């Protein structure tokens, strides 16, 4: 029924949905913007990340890809490069849900340390919207679920400081 | 740092805060009203319940107790009986946080099945507010945390149906 | 001298006598009305019940039987079906004592869970009084003893909270 | 939750409450008056008695003690001696509950045979009430619980003579 | 030739066909309405249910699904929610036979106790009929077979009470 | 509670009641007329039959017996021979239920093959009604239960062809 984790790993959810705008025909969002928001326990610089799973609902049609080259000079991201070919890509229709999973690896081991997603491994997620009518409206999009696979940590409980009265 | 569960148990949280009113000088809330709201997995009729932990913030001063006899005839609960003496009781001040833990047991085993909290084991939680001024305002109260200790179930993950595109 | 219980069971008494009326020629009383009154420890929904023993003293003559079909539309029970043939039946005389024992079983094990006596196993006890004189008086009846066979629980003692002074 | 009995003993209750009067400023009651009233099985002359537990609710203030010397000449007990110092003693307030436990021993073994509480071991319980107003009212007192610890006997059951009809 | 049961289970049939009406464009029937009708032996509250198999013949075209949310306010069921995705769904044509099998499970074991189909697991079966002509006729439907998989119980035989004469 | 089958046998019921007429003072029915109607699985020519159990309700008084000689020339059976003395016989009253069991054997083994009940082992069942009033009414009779003991065959299930839709 659910995707199973590896031998010593667990899954963790982001917790809240989020909505963004088109902002000049395409939307770009770096993977380190998502990773700095998990808060059950936070993620440290040297923590290995194994997988990620997404779920988006757009309001138009277009294509998506994962790219490393992103050209921008002020605010808006204006252009990007060619899709990388170890991460999925494809096209989507309006008001339909699509989702994918990413796998991360290093030349000598499985996983990637959290600090590397900011130096030398700065992958981004780009959505391309096609139509260009004069009278129009910026096609927005909304994230419904974000998951990350980490090393196993203990389950949450209640704090002893909660108990003031006694028996 | 946190309260540890028993040998084969786990903790589970209710998820959202809630606020109620005084409603004629005292507030009563049966424990089966709380138990029908847990939703990670739901609780079934024959599931054993071991403990509970609470956290409330009132807006006046008074006393609290756990009682089995509750007299009511329409809507409002008007009067209650004497506090049971295997569950805590005490007094609280205005705008201060107090919390306690409950333990449940049977004559032959530890725990209590969920269905019994509605027949023959219908415990309630009662808050008594003292002052009676003519010009006044119904002292409200707010729950900040509710936890229950259950049998161990597997951790949540993402659903395979989330993935539409592929590599 | 006394009836012996099974290998891991004990007997328990109801504690108090009770008297009822004829109420239109016959009296009906469901077995779940008796079982909700035992109070040494109370009985829970999933507790297995093995046997029962009764003792009644009527004030007229008639017949008794255990039946599952009972027709009633408001208050009074007006008519019943045919006696079941795994439970006793017979006739009685006025101001004489009669008593019997019942045995309960399931298709795969001995006993019956307490909750079932309310759904799909709702047996009732019916007393039929014969005479129909114009000038008359409702023949009453009185229970002298009720016993149930349960799983073994520990004997009653005194509570530590009883002792205030010390040596 | 409850006081545990010794290795081969059981507890037994007296069954009914009882109320007495002050009767000239103090009330005296010998322990053999209580012991001749237990009736589940009765107590025989050579049965060893181990402990006793009491619970009283008075209607005034005063002191209580266990004494062996009691002076009386007709009806009323008029004066008593000094409290023994292997049994508790203390003071009590009006309309409050107090209780204690007694331990009995012999120079060579634990316990005391029932017949001795009448010859050479005739302990009594005395309640002293203090105030002496002209306009007054005899301070009464009421026993709420009496328990005795005995040798183990089998649990009560129903009698075979109860069953007249059959299957 | 036939579907095989699990290691310690048996199949049982409902015995009789049944016909219903459309009643404002859709028909809803809770699974606990079917389960209270098996009568070879009846089903008790704590009996585990493993599977079910159906067979229906409609008189129009439409779709079917299993849903937990059903909105109704008096008699008629007026609207329902979204189909659950662990139970089948699809479309059917007029005067053709379709059938399916359901599987039930819990977070820790296989099966579901009979009492849960009424609290917190109240699944329903809904049939949607499409056409809306002014001159029309309520599309009826008819059940041809209903089966349930249970724990093994012994085969039926004749009762000794049948034999009156002898050799 | 029920009659137990032999070491490798099972019981099977006929399924439906049936009513017949008196037809000139006596009714005759050969045992092969009953055996050709069982239909769960049908019975083959070489299948061994061990026992049979009956249950009839008449509308008059008379006698019954099992006989091999039956004289008839057209339709009606007019006369029969003497009762066999390895099968029961007796008398019955009006509107009362009577029933019996038959045992079948061969000179070298237990049982009798189904084909033999038509050649050389053609037993019949005859009911004799006594009264002969001019103004009268043909005394009818009705079978309530018929059972046969066979070799063990597997329990019924549902057919795979029932399932058209899928998950």
Contact present, F77 and F70 (Cβ < 8 Å): yes
On whether any CB of chain E is under 8 Å from the CB of C105, the answer is: no
Nearest to B23 by CA among B135, B140, B131: B140
On whether any CB of chain B is under 8 Å from the CB of C151, the answer is: yes
- Do C and A share at least 3 CB pairs under 8 Å? no
Q: Residue F149 and residue D162: Cα distance in Å, rounded?
A: 43
Contact present, A130 and A62 (Cβ < 8 Å): yes
Residue of F nearest to E102 (CA): F167
- Give the strand pairing for E70-74 and E76-80: antiparallel
Nearest to F150 by CA among F53, F17, F55: F53
| Helix (H/G/I), strand (E/B), else coil: A37 | coil
Residues 6+ apart with CB under 8 A from D54: D99, D100, D101, D102, D143, D145, D146
Contact present, A27 and A141 (Cβ < 8 Å): yes
Residue of A nearest to B51 (CA): A158
Query: Look-up: residue for tokens 């029970």?
Result: C77
- Do F and A share at least 3 CB pairs under 8 Å? no
The reply to whether residue C120 touches residue E43, judged by beta carbons under 8 angstroms, is yes
On whether any CB of chain A is under 8 Å from the CB of B160, the answer is: yes
**Residue-wise DSSP of D12-45:** EE--S-EEE--TTTEEEEEHHHHHT---SSPPPT
Question: How far does A33 lie from chain B, in Å, by closest CA?
Answer: 21
On whether any CB of chain C is under 8 Å from the CB of D53, the answer is: yes
Nearest to E148 by CA among E75, E58, E52: E52
The reply to whether residue E44 touches residue C113, judged by beta carbons under 8 angstroms, is yes
Q: What are phi and psi of F162, to 5 degrees?
A: -75, -25
* Count of C-beta atoms within a 10 Å radius of residue F125: 19
On whether any CB of chain E is under 8 Å from the CB of B46, the answer is: yes
From chain C, the residues in CB contact with D98 under 8 A are 164-165
Residue of B nearest to A12 (CA): B157
Tokens of F41: 């699985």
Tokens of D57: 């609710």
Q: Residue F120 has what DSSP assignment?
A: T
Q: What are phi and psi of D51, to 5 degrees?
A: -145, 170
The reply to whether residue F163 touches residue E1, judged by beta carbons under 8 angstroms, is no
SS3 content of chain A, % helix, strand, coil (to 5): 10, 40, 50
Nearest to A165 by CA among B87, D37, F117, E4: B87
Q: Residue E33 and residue E117: Cα distance in Å, rounded?
A: 10
Tokens of F154: 């597997």
Which member of B85, B106, B121 has the closest CB to residue C161? B85
On whether any CB of chain D is under 8 Å from the CB of C100, the answer is: yes
Q: Which resolution, in Å, applies to this structure?
A: 2.4
**Residue-wise DSSP of A113-142:** EGGGGGTT---EEEEEE----SS-----EE
Q: Residue A4 and residue A10: Cα distance in Å, rounded?
A: 9
Which member of B107, B108, B115 has the closest CB to residue C45? B115
Which member of C4, C157, C165 has the closest CB to residue D100? C165
Tokens of D37: 């009233």
Residue of E nearest to B160 (CA): E85
The alpha carbon of C98 is separated from its chain's Cα centroid by a whole number of angstroms, namely 14
SS3 content of chain D, % helix, strand, coil (to 5): 10, 40, 50
From chain B, the residues in CB contact with C45 under 8 A are 113, 115-116, 119
On whether any CB of chain A is under 8 Å from the CB of B40, the answer is: no
On whether any CB of chain D is under 8 Å from the CB of C155, the answer is: yes
Residues 6+ apart with CB under 8 A from F38: F12, F14, F148
The reply to whether residue B45 touches residue E106, judged by beta carbons under 8 angstroms, is no
Residue of C nearest to E41 (CA): C107
Tokens of E106: 């819990």
From chain B, the residues in CB contact with A155 under 8 A are 10-11, 155
Q: List the single best residue of B44, B86, B112, B120 to mutate versus C (max C Cβ within 10 A).
A: B120
Which member of C46, C115, C153 has the closest CB to residue B107? C153
Question: How far does D74 lie from chain C, in Å, by closest CA?
Answer: 33
From chain E, the residues in CB contact with C113 under 8 A are 44-46
The reply to whether residue F162 touches residue E99, judged by beta carbons under 8 angstroms, is yes
Q: Residue D65 and residue D85: Cα distance in Å, rounded?
A: 9
Tokens of C45: 């929904």
Residue of B nearest to C44 (CA): B116
**Exposed, middle or buried, C150 (CB in 10 Å: 0-12/13-18/19+)?**
buried
On whether any CB of chain B is under 8 Å from the CB of C162, the answer is: no
Q: What are phi and psi of D33, to 5 degrees?
A: -70, -35
Q: What are phi and psi of A142, to 5 degrees?
A: -145, 130
- Do E and C share at least 3 CB pairs under 8 Å? yes
Which member of A2, A10, A166 has the closest CB to residue B159? A2
The reply to whether residue F160 touches residue E101, judged by beta carbons under 8 angstroms, is no
Nearest to A54 by CA among A10, A81, A17, A94: A17
Residue of E nearest to F158 (CA): E2
On whether any CB of chain F is under 8 Å from the CB of E5, the answer is: yes
Tokens of E46: 């704590």
Contact present, D125 and D70 (Cβ < 8 Å): no
Residue of E nearest to B43 (CA): E120
Q: Residue E89 and residue E155: Cα distance in Å, rounded?
A: 35
Which experimental approach was used here? Answer: cryo-EM
Nearest to C56 by CA among C24, C88, C84: C88
- Do F and D share at least 3 CB pairs under 8 Å? no
Q: Residue E106 has what DSSP assignment?
A: -
């Amino acid at each position: 029924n659910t995707i199973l984790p590896q031998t010593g790993c667990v899954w963790q959810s982001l917790g809240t949905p989020l909505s963004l705008s088109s902002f000049n025909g395409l939307g770009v969002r770096f993977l380190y913007s998502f990773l700095k928001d998990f808060a059950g326990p936070r993620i440290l610089e040297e923590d290995l990340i194994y997988r990620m799973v997404f779920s988006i609902t757009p309001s138009y049609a277009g294509t998506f890809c994962l790219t490393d080259d992103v050209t921008t000079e002020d605010g808006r991201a204006v252009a990007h490069g060619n899709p990388m070919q170890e991460f999925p890509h494809g096209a989507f229709h309006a008001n339909e849900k699509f989702g994918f999973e990413l796998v991360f690896t290093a030349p000598t081991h499985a996983g990637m340390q959290n600090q590397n997603f900011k130096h030398s491994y700065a992958v981004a997620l780009c959505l391309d919207f096609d139509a260009q009518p004069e009278g129009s409206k910026n096609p927005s999009y909304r994230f419904n679920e974000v998951w990350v696979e980490r090393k196993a940590f203990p389950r949450a409980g209640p704090l002893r400081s909660l108990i003031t009265v006694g028996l």
